[PDB]
Amino acid sequence: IEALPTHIKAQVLAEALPWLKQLHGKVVVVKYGGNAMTDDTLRRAFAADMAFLRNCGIHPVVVHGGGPQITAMLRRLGIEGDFKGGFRVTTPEVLDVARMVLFGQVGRELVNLINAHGPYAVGITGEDAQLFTAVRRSVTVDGVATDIGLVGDVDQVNTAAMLDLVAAGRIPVVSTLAPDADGVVHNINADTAAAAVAEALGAEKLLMLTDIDGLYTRWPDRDSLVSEIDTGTLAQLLPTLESGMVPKVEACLRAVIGGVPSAHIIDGRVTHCVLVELFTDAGTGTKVVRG
Template sequence: MSGQGTTQTGTLPFGRLDATADATAEPTAELTADATAELPWLEELQGRTVVVKFGGNAMVDPALHRTFAQDVVELWHAGLRPVVVHGGGPQISAMLDRLDLEVRFEAGLRVTTPETMDVVRMVLTGQVQRELVGALNAHGPFAVGMSGEDAHTMTAVRRPAWVDGRQVDIGLVGEVVAVEPGTVRTLLEEGRIPVISPVARGADGEVYNVNADLAASALAVALGAERLVVLTDVEGLYADWPRS
């Protein structure tokens, strides 16, 4: 992120903006002035990129889902350039259960077999992302869905887990090692809201399941985002993981 960039966790820290103009319209000086008068600090973020990670746990609440979409669109109306990276853990687990496939975690990471990876891609891009894009586009033609695979946006390498000091193979779980943000920047310049699922391809040709928090962080750095906001139901963060 840029030198002034910050990371925040918890509820969306931007408040309710009550944008009353047509949601399909470009941000106007009048609308932006109304928003910044209500929340003056927004003026500092006008024209700046903000990456928001929306967790799968939050997405299972329909009311919260709708409120999140409205908030993101209102940020756009206030002159910000939001980018959404979403998770989908509960939805993936539910689909695995329906298909009678094992649901297993090691060190907080999903053990991802090739069969599980097929489900991850299907659920993240075909279900969770489509629902989020639809919620955003209920307010106008804003959101465009894409995967970290698309246009080589994210490149990952296989990542093992460490459990009690020993390395554990967790399958097709990856760590982002490179980001090509050109496509995301193009969408932002076109006035769109990119909605990105955390799946990435490796140089080895494999497709990897990537932790959404880490994917959002890597993308925020590559975009020079002013802020990274992580929406989560987790009550706290480790300051020095895995040594804490």
């Protein structure tokens, strides 16, 4: 990287100015998962990029998943699953495992990776200071809406408390668990939690890290890849996409329709992906605006 003339190193920095302006003082919610969370070089770059935003006056909020890690701990504990449709039923036993894996294992790794750059990361759930609540969600198996345990969606967000925390210069690492109105803790899907935090906080952008290049209209036509698209078009397309892509697209529609200016689906296997997506017009992701 040092055999490259310094006069174009400069032009790469200078070309970040327009996006430093539009994001200075704003909130960016980043959903974090996939290979970016499982590979160690990608992990360290993600943490470094969170430090970058924070030392630019941008306000990142990180919402993380960790579905496979829950599964692995349940197998190690010999906890037998129940499966309606293709969904595991979240018993009280499964929730305590979900909670301790997400908040006491996965969030801790991220907190410590970011905190190698300074006192920034703080781990939280909806349980802490009552930052958000959950409402229990049913799921449609074949054609019947059916119960699958203590699983929910974000109900209300303590917008005020959350923005205080970010104004103190802290990067909130969020594990998606929250009490319902009776104090019983549910597990929320991280993709939807991210979209609801973005809307609640008036984020400028929602970033969805994914193990893909971007949205393909008719996969696997290599040139069905789009780089921008609006909600109306996207919504009519959602019933056709692979099961993997649905949660990320639903999050982007809920967010952008909820008034977040743009949601982005970017390639988590690219080192420093959020740097390229935010401060560079070379991003391979796909941007969602309203229309």
